[PDB]
PDB file of C-alpha atoms and ligand atoms in Angstrom:
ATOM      1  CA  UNK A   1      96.405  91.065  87.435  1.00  0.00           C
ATOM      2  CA  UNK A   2      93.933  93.618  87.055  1.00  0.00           C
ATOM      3  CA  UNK A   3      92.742  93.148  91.150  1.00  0.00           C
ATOM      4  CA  UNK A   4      96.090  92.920  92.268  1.00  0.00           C
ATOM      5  CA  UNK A   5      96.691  96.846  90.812  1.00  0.00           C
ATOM      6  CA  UNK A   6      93.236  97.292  93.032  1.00  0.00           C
ATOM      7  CA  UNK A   7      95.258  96.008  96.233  1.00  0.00           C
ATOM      8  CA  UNK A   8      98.680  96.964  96.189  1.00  0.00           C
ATOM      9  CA  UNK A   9      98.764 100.007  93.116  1.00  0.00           C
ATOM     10  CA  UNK A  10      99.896 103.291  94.178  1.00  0.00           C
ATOM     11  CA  UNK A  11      97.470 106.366  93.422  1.00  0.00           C
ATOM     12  CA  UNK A  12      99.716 108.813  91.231  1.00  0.00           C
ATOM     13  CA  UNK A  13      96.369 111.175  90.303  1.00  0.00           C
ATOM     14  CA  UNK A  14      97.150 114.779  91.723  1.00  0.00           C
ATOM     15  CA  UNK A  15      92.934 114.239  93.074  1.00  0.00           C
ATOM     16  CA  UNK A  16      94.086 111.201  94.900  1.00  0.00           C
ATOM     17  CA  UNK A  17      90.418 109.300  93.878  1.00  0.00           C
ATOM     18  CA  UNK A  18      92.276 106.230  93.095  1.00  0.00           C
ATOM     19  CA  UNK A  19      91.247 106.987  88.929  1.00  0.00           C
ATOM     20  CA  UNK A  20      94.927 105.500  88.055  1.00  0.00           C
ATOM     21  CA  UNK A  21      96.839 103.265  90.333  1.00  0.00           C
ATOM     22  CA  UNK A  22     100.103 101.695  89.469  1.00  0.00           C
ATOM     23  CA  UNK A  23     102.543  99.125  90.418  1.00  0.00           C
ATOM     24  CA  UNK A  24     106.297  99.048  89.361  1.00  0.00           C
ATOM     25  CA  UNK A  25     106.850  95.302  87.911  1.00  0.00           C
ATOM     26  CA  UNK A  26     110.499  95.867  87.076  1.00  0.00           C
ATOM     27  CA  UNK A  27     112.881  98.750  87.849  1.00  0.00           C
ATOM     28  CA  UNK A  28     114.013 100.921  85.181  1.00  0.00           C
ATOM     29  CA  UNK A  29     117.734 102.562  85.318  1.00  0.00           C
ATOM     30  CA  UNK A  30     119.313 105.476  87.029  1.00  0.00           C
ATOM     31  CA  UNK A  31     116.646 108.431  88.585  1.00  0.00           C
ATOM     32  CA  UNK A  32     115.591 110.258  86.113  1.00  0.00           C
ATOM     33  CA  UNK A  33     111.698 110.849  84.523  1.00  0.00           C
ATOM     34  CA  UNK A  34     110.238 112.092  80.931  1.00  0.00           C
ATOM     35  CA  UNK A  35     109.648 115.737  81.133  1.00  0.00           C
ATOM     36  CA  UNK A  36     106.334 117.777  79.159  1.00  0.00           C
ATOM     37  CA  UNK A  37     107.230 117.480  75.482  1.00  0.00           C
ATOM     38  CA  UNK A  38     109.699 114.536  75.585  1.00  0.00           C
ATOM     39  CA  UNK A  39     109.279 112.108  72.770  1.00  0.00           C
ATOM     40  CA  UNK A  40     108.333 108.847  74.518  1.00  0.00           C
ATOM     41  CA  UNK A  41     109.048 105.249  73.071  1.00  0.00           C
ATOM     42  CA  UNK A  42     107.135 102.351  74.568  1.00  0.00           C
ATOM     43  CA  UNK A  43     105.538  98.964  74.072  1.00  0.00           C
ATOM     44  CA  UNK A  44     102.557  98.308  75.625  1.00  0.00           C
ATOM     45  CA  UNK A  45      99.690  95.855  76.520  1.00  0.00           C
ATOM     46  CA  UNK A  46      96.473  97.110  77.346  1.00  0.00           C
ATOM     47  CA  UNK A  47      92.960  95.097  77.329  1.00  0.00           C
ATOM     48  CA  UNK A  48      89.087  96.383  79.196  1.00  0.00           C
ATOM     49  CA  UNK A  49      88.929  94.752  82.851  1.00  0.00           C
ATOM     50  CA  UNK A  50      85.502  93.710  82.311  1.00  0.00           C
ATOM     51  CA  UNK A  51      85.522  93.487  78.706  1.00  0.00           C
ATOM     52  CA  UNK A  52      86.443  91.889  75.295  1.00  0.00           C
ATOM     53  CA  UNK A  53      89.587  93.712  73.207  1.00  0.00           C
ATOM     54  CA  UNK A  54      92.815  93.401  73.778  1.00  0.00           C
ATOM     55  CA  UNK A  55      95.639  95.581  71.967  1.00  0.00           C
ATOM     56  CA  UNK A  56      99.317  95.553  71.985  1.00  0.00           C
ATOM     57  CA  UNK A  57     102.251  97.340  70.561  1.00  0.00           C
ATOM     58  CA  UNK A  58     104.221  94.085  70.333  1.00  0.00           C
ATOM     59  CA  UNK A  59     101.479  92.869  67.523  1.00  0.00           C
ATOM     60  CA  UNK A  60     102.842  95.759  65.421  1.00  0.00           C
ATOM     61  CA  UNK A  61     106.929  94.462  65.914  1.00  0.00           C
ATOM     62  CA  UNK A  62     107.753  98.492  66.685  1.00  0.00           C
ATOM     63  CA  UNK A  63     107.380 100.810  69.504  1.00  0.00           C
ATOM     64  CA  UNK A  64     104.336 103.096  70.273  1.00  0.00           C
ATOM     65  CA  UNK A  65     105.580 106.753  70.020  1.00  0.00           C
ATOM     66  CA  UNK A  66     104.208 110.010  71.355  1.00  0.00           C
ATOM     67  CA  UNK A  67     104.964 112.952  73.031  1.00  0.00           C
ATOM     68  CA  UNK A  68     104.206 113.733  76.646  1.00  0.00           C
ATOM     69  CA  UNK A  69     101.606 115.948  78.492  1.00  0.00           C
ATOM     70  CA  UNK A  70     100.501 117.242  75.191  1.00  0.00           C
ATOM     71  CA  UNK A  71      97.321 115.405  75.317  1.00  0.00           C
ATOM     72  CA  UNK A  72      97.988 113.111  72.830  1.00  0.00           C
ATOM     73  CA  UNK A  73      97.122 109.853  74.630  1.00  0.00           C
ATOM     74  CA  UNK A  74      94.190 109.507  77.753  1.00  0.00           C
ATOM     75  CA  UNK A  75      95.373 111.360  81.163  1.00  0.00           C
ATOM     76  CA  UNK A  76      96.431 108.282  82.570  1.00  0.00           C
ATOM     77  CA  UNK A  77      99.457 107.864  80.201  1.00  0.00           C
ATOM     78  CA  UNK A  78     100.231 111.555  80.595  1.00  0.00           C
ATOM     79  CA  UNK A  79     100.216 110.653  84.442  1.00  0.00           C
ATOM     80  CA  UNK A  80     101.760 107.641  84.491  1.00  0.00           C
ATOM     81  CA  UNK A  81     104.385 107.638  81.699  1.00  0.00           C
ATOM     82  CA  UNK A  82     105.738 110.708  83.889  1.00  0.00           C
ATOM     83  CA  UNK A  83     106.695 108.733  86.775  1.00  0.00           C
ATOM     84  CA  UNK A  84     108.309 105.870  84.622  1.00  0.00           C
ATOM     85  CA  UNK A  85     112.743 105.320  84.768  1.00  0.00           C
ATOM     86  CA  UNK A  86     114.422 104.327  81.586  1.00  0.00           C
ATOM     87  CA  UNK A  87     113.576 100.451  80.859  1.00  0.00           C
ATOM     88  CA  UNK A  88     111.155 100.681  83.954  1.00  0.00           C
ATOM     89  CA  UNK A  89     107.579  98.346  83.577  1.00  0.00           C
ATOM     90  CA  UNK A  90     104.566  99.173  85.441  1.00  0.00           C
ATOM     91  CA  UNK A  91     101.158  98.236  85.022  1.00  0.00           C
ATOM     92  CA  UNK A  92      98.255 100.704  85.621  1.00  0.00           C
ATOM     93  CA  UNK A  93      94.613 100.422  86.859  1.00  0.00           C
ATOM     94  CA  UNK A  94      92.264 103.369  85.232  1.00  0.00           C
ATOM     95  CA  UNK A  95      88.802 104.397  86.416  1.00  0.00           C
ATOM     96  CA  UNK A  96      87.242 105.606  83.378  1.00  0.00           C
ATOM     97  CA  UNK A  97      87.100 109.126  83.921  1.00  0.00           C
ATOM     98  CA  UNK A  98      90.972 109.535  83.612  1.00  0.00           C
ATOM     99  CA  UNK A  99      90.451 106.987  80.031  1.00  0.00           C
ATOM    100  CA  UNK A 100      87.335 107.481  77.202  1.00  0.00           C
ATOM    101  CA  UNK A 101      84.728 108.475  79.929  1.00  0.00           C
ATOM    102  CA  UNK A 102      80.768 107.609  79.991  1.00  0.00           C
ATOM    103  CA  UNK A 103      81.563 108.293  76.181  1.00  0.00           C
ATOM    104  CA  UNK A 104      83.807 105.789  75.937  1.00  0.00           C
ATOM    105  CA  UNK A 105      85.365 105.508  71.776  1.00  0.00           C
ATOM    106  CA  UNK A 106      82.945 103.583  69.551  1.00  0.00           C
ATOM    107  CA  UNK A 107      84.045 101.299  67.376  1.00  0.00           C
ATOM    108  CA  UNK A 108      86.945 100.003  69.803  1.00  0.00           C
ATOM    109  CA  UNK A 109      86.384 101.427  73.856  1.00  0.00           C
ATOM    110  CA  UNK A 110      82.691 101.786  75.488  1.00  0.00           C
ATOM    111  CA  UNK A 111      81.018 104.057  77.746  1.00  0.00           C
ATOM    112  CA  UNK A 112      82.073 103.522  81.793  1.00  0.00           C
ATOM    113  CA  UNK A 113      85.314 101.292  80.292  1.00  0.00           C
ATOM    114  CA  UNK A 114      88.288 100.366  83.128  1.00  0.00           C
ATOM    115  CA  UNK A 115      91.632  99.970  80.964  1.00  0.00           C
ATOM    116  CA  UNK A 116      94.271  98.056  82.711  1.00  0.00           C
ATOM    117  CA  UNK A 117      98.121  98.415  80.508  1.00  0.00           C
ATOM    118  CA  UNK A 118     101.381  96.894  81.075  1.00  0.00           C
ATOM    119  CA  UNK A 119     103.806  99.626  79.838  1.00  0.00           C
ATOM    120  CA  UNK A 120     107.507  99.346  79.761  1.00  0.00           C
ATOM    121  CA  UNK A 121     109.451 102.645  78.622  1.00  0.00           C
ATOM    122  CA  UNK A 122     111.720 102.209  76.296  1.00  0.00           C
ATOM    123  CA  UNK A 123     113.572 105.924  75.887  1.00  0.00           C
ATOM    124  CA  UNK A 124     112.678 109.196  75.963  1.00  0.00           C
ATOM    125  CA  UNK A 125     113.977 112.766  73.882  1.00  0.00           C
ATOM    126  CA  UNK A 126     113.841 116.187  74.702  1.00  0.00           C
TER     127      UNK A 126
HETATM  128  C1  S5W B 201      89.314 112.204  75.634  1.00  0.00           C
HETATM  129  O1  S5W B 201      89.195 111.087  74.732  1.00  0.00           O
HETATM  130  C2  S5W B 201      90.329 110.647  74.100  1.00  0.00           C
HETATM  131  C3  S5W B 201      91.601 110.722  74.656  1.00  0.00           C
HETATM  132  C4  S5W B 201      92.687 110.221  73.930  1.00  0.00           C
HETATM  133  C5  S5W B 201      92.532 109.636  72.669  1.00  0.00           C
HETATM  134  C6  S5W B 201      93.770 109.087  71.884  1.00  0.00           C
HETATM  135  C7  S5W B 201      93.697 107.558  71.908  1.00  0.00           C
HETATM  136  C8  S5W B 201      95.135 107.040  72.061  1.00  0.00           C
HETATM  137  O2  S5W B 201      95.173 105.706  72.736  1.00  0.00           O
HETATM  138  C9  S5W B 201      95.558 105.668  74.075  1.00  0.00           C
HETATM  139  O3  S5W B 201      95.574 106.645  74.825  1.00  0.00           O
HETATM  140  C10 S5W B 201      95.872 104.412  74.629  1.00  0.00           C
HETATM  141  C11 S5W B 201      97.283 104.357  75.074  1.00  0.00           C
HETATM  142  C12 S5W B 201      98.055 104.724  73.909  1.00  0.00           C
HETATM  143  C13 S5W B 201      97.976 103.616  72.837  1.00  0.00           C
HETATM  144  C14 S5W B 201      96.659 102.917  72.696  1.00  0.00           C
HETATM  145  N1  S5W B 201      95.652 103.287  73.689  1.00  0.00           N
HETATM  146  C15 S5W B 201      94.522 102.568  73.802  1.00  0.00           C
HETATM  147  O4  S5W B 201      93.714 102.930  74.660  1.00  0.00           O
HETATM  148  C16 S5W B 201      94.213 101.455  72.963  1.00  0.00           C
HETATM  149  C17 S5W B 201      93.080 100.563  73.623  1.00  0.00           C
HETATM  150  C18 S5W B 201      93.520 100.002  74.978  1.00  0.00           C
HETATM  151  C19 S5W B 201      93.000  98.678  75.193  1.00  0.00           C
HETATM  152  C20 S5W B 201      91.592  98.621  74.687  1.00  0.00           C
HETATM  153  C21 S5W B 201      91.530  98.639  73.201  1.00  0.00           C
HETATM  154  C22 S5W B 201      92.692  99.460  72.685  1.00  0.00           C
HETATM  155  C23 S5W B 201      93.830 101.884  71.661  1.00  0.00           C
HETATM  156  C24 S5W B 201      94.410 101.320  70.521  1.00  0.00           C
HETATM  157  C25 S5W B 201      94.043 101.750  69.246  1.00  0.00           C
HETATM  158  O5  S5W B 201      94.575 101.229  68.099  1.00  0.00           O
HETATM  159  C26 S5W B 201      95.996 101.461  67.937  1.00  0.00           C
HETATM  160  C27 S5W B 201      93.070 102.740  69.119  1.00  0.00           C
HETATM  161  C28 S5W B 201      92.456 103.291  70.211  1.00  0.00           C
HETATM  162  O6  S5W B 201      91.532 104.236  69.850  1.00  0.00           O
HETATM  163  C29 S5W B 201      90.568 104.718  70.812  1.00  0.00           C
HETATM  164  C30 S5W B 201      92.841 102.875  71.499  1.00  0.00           C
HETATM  165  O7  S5W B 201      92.621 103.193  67.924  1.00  0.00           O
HETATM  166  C31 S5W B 201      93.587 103.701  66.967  1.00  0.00           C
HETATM  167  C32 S5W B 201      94.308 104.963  67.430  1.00  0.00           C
HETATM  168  O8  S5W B 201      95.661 104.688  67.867  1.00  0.00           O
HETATM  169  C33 S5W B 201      96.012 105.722  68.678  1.00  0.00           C
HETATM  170  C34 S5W B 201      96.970 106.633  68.234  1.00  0.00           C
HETATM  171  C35 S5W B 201      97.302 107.691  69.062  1.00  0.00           C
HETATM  172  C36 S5W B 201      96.693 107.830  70.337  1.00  0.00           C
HETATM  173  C37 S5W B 201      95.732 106.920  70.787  1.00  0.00           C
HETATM  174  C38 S5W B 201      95.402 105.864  69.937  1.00  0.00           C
HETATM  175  C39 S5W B 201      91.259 109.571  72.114  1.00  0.00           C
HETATM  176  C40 S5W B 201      90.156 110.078  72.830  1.00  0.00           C
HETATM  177  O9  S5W B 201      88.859 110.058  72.356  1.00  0.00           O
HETATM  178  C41 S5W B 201      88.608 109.099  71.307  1.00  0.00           C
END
């Protein structure tokens, strides 16, 4: 999953160095996209490519909330949430420097860490 992001995932950083690349897996509804500020509701699976954790919303039975472009989450969820249709799924590829960095997040991320999430938005609020 995480190599076929790698082959056919479209490159939605503003740089266009391939640091978040994303594939739609279902279609959400109608046109429209979260906007700066927007409450966001998702559930989400995310796990390190060449690593051992793996974390998911679903373990916690309620959405993952948060509000967008505020940096609140890592710059690929600022990115890619932004592009995502009510009830839409993608999953996203993410090159650490748009993630934790050569820091990484001791105890749970380390340094030079690829994150690869399934995300499917659930609703959004202004
Ligand atoms: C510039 O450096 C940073 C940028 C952003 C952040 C906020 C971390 C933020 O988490 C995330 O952005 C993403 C997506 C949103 C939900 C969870 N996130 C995660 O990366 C998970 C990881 C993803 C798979 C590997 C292990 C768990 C992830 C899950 C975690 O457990 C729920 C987790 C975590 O902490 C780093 C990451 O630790 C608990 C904190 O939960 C939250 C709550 C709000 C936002 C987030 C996590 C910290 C930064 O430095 C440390």
């Amino acid at each position: 999953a995480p190599a076929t992001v790698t082959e056919q995932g479209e490159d939605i950083t503003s740089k266009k160095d391939r640091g978040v690349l994303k594939i739609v897996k279902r279609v959400g509804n109608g046109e429209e996209t979260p906007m700066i500020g927007d409450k966001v509701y998702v559930h989400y699976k995310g796990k390190l490519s060449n690593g051992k954790k793996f974390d998911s919303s679903h373990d916690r039975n309620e959405p993952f909330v948060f509000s967008l472009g505020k940096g609140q989450v890592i710059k690929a969820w600022d990115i890619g949430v932004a592009t995502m249709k009510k009830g839409e799924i993608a999953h996203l590829l993410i090159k650490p420097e748009y993630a934790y960095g050569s820091a990484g997040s001791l105890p749970k991320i380390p340094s030079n860490a690829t994150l690869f999430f399934e995300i499917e938005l659930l609703d959004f609020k202004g």
